[PDB]
Amino acid sequence: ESIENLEDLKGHSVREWVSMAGPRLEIHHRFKNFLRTHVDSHGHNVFKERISDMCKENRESLVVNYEDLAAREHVLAYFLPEAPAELLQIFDEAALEVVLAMYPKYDRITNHIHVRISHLPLVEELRSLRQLHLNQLIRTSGVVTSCTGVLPQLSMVKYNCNKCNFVLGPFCQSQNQEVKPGSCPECQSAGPFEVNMEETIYQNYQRIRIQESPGKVAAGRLPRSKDAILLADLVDSCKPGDEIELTGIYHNNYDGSLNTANGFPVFATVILANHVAKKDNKVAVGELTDEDVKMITSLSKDQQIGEKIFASIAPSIYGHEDIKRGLALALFGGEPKNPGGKHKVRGDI
């Protein structure tokens, strides 16, 4: 079988290199080992816990931290911003067959798992994006101004022949142009074709527009903006007005409309998303770990917990203990209810 290697030395480009079978298999094995052997500072096997917390909720999406991927596997962190589409596909396959080792029946729940990269250190201001960043993984921040609805996009399309029953085999749909068959292999009729709507595989699609946050640099100047594409589970990760933090591949393609608008061979650009966080929702219950729950529930055992919480609100303000108490009660809030299913009363304070 294909033999293991030192990965970082090669004569090819990075994309070509990770596309070749030998290093692809080595990368696959390395990421598999990284998932199955990475540990926390305290020694907790991180990704066993994360995969269990994923498979419990059927979230079919595994979040990975770059700042420890670089710690464990160097060359994977090296190739990732340089050839992100290829390496992320390899990561998806490796993560899938790790998850099907931990939970063998999980293929009943989902046939594909996406690896989402977080805490990417090469952050970029939104107006500072240039041709130097093309086809590379970037991280940017901005307020979502617009969103399409969640729409079905073709991913693996089978075409019915225009004159007979035959289904032309799967074409992998792109984000650049609508892939087409040309002519049928069973009988070389050509031109228009019908999509087999039942056997064709679709994926969720949502296109968002993000611009610079109003208070960041737009001091009377107009803000710059970029389009981003969310696919599969990333849809509904954000709404208009959300101060998101977006990781994605900065991707470009030919656009005739821009060419005629500018009078130059100007290529449109879009961010193929790979992770969406929010800069106000810095913590969420879907991200809490077992250790966080354990130390929270240990703190609740203390009889001083009420006083600790009251003292913990705005600690740089002296006095105003009644204010801190009232703000704590409002910050935690009461319980909403609807007795009889016909009479609502609010829980908020």
Partner: protein, 446 residues
């Protein structure tokens, strides 16, 4: 093989060469290699050291230095600028490869500053097309930065040969013969976006500056195009000197090609195969290779501070009674009011802003109010402060706009949608806002 070892194997060579442009190339390479500064040796070798950085690709060259090198060369560059410009870029590439750390695919650009003659916008006639030209104008609108395909790399779909360095002009042009000499294909090509080369691209609308505007005439506007390092350096409202060349840009919507189809009051030209039965119009665009203002951090301070400035600020720091010295120097027109001068000086120096452990800010800026009769020097203090300091703003309490001291919300008919017009305090962000007639605000601002 025989001594006649060349059947023209694999050759589609240039059967003729632009003599003038190549002479310009070699002589400009000699200029870059041999022109020397008075305080040392070989100025542009030292300036070309900076081009190994990932973001840097442009060398800024002084046209008067080129004239001091040779007048005939400078005249030829000025007269034949657009013709010779890619050859000058090749000369710079040949010059900068000796640093040995450059990527092989990296493009380099030449940018001529210090052009002696400045033309008005009215003088940009068709006779100026292709010539090196300097203009002054006020920027009106700046569009987003885009990647522009400078040269495509294409794959031939029926013999799998790659074709590199396909120059573009204006319509997106795929190659028109295959590089493989025996291959018959002239239409079926695929762009390799990853191995193609792009440059940063921006277009900005300028207009005639205030000094140049003729009496009783509408301001004339011009589309300037900036590339590579110049793609955000000029912002709307700035008065900037642009150097580059006036070019003609076709109506690209009218041109059909093997790459892409057409996309469809004056007559225009006719008769081209690519144009079909349509007619092609033209418009003038200033392709700016350089931009500068028309009149101009701790690391930045440490680099900028020359030895005289270091000694001056050190002597000032050790100056006893620097308090009264700075009060007198900053407010010489003011008689008396030493306490007020001291207070406003402390306002200029300001306190330390701080952030609490809970991510909540503590104010560092102080605020000073000067109450007085309309006959006194209260306005004089504000005028001296705003004349002195950079980034400061002067305003009345009453607003000269829909936005006042603080922002206001206004529709724009470009979208019929609400946006924020900035107020004086935001324009004075990280600075000083001098507010005369402070007692007579509107309720919104107050």
């Amino acid at each position: 093989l025989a001594a006649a070892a060349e059947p023209g194997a694999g050759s589609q060579h240039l059967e003729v060469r632009d003599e003038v442009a190549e002479k310009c190339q070699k002589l400009f390479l000699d200029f870059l290699e041999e022109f020397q500064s008075s305080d040392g040796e070989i100025k542009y070798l030292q300036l070309a050291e900076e081009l190994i950085r990932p973001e840097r690709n442009t060398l800024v060259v002084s046209f008067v230095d080129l004239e001091q090198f040779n007048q005939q060369l400078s005249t030829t560059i000025q007269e034949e600028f657009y013709r010779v410009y890619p050859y000058l870029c090749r000369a710079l590439k040949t010059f900068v490869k000796d640093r040995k750390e450059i990527p092989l695919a990296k493009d380099f650009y030449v940018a001529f500053q210090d052009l002696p003659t400045r033309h008005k916008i009215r003088e940009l006639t068709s006779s100026r097309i292709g010539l090196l030209t300097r203009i002054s104008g006020q920027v009106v609108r700046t569009h987003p930065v885009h990647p522009e395909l400078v040269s495509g790399t294409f794959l031939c779909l029926d013999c799998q040969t790659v074709i590199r360095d396909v120059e573009q002009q204006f319509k997106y042009t795929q190659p028109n013969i295959c590089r493989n000499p025996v291959c018959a294909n002239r239409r079926r090509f695929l762009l390799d976006t990853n191995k193609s080369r792009f440059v940063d691209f921006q277009k900005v609308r300028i207009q005639e500056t205030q000094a140049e505007l003729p009496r009783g005439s509408i301001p004339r506007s011009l589309e300037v195009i900036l590339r590579a390092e110049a793609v955000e350096s000029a912002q709307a409202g700035d008065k900037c000197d642009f150097t580059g060349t006036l070019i003609v840009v076709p109506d690209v919507s009218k041109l059909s090609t093997p790459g892409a189809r057409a996309e469809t009051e004056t007559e225009g030209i006719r008769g081209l195969r690519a144009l079909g039965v349509r007619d092609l119009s033209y418009r003038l665009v200033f392709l700016a290779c350089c931009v500068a203002p028309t009149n101009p951090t701790a690391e930045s301070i440490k680099n900028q501070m020359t030895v005289k400035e270091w000694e001056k600020v050190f002597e000032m720091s050790q100056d006893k009674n620097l308090y009264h010295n700075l009060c007198t120097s900053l407010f010489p027109t003011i008689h008396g009011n030493d306490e007020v001068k001291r207070g406003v000086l402390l306002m200029l120096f300001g306190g330390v802003p701080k952030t609490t452990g809970e991510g909540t800010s503590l104010r560092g800026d102080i605020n000073v109010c000067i109450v007085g009769d309309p006959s006194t020097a209260k306005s004089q203090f504000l005028k001296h402060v705003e004349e002195f300091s950079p980034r400061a703003v002067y305003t009345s309490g009453k607003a000269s706009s829909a936005a006042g001291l603080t922002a206001a919300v206004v529709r724009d008919e470009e979208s019929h949608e609400f946006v924020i017009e900035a107020g004086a305090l935001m324009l004075a962000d990280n600075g000083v806002c001098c507010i005369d007639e402070f007692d007579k605000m509107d309720v919104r601002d107050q």
